[PDB]
Amino acid sequence: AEEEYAEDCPELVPIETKNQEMAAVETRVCETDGCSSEAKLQCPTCIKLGIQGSYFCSQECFKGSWATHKLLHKKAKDEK
Ligand SMILES: [Zn+2]
Numbered sequence: 001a002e003e004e005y006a007e008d009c010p011e012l013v014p015i016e017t018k019n020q021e022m023a024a025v026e027t028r029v030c031e032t033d034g035c036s037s038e039a040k041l042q043c044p045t046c047i048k049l050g051i052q053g054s055y056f057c058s059q060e061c062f063k064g065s066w067a068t069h070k071l072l073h074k075k076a077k078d079e080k
């Protein structure tokens with residue numbers, strides 16, 4: 001054999017909030033489709049990859065959703 005995947009689900013991170021600016025952005029739900037909870041955490045690997053949103057509600061929930069979330073990281077790119 002050669003090698004296997006090197007994916008990992010480390011401790012999530014808090015969503016960098018801001019002051020009560022006029023041009024603020026409300027509404028924050030768990031990224032998971034089957035989770036309508038308040039999103040407070042964010043995906044670390046996402047910030048690096050370059051994906052929008054990616055906000056979780058809790059680690060306990062992230063650990064699970066990660067099973068599918070990780071798949072999102074490897075989207076289906078095309079060449080036109
Ligand atoms: Zn992510």
Ligand SMILES: [Zn+2]
Pocket residue numbers: 030031032035036037056057058061062
């Ligand atoms: Zn959640």
